[PDB]
Paper text:
STK19 has also been identified as a putative factor involved in the transcription-coupled nucleotide excision repair (TC-NER) pathway. STK19 binds more strongly to double-stranded DNA and RNA (dsDNA/dsRNA) than to ssDNA.
We determined the 1.32 Å crystal structure of human STK19, containing residues 31-254. The structure of STK19 reveals a compact fold consisting of three winged helix (WH) domains (WH1-WH3) packed together. Notably, the WH3 nucleic acid recognition helix (WH3-H3) is less accessible compared to WH1-H3 and WH2-H3, owing to its proximity to WH1-H2. Of the investigated mutations, K186N, R200W, and R215W significantly compromised STK19 dsDNA binding ability.
Numbering used by the authors: 33 to 254
Write the structure that this text describes.
């Protein structure tokens, strides 16, 4: 009833665009959606509906317990076109965005489909790899990829570890949500405390316990 769409918009607002100088489309992770939409089946169904209505792209990122990213297709398009301006791979990127991206919601593309169905030459596929738009998936396919995602991946994993440590260091390896969110962020946490808390909850790296003091984040040792 708009649940996943509302969750995506709440999480998108947390993304610090300026951290990457606006070079990356804002990214939210599937497990963050589960923090706000705890019925995973409802969340997945509504995300699939958004994918089939053409509004979001699902991207393989590969974090333990939070494998997929979610991006608005128009944010991906406008900025990939922007990251490609005046570069050698601009033509190949434009062809990919105009013809391949609209043709499905898939996370990956087969080599034979790219060459035979869409008419890409090997050199043009190499341009897409150099642009950061494709990465190798297996011997016959490529993942859709986000130019500049490597920096996001490194900041994200370090921040996940640091926020989890804030919980681990607390008494009995548990910390109230209001307490955590009011702490100074460890310097390595670049994407923000709240952004990270939603990943920890949705991935089940912390349990979200309802108490008469509000939400308690508990490391799930048992």
């Amino acid at each position: 009833p708009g649940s996943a769409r509302a969750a995506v918009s709440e999480l998108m607002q947390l993304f610090p665009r300026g951290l990457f100088e606006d070079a990356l489309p804002p990214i939210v992770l599937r497990s963050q959606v589960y923090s706000l939409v705890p019925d995973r089946t409802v969340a997945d169904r509504q995300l699939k509906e958004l994918q089939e209505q053409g509004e979001i792209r699902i991207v393989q990122l590969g974090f333990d317990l939070d494998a997929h990213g979610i991006i608005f297709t128009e944010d991906y398009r406008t900025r990939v076109l922007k990251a490609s301006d005046g570069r050698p791979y601009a033509g190949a990127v434009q062809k990919f965005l105009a013809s391949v991206l609209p043709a499905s919601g898939d996370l990956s593309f087969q080599q034979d489909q790219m060459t035979q169905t869409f008419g890409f030459r090997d050199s043009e596929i190499t341009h897409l790899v150099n642009a950061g738009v494709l990465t190798v998936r297996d011997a016959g396919s490529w993942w859709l990829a986000v130019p500049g995602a490597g920096r996001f991946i490194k900041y994200f994993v370090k921040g996940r570890q640091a926020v989890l440590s804030m919980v681990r260091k607390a008494k009995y390896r548990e910390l109230l949500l209001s307490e955590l969110l009011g702490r100074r962020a460890p310097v390595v946490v670049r994407l923000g405390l709240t952004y990270h808390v939603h990943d920890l909850i949705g991935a089940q790296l912390v349990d979200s316990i309802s108490t008469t003091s509000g939400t308690l984040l508990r490391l799930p040792e048992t």
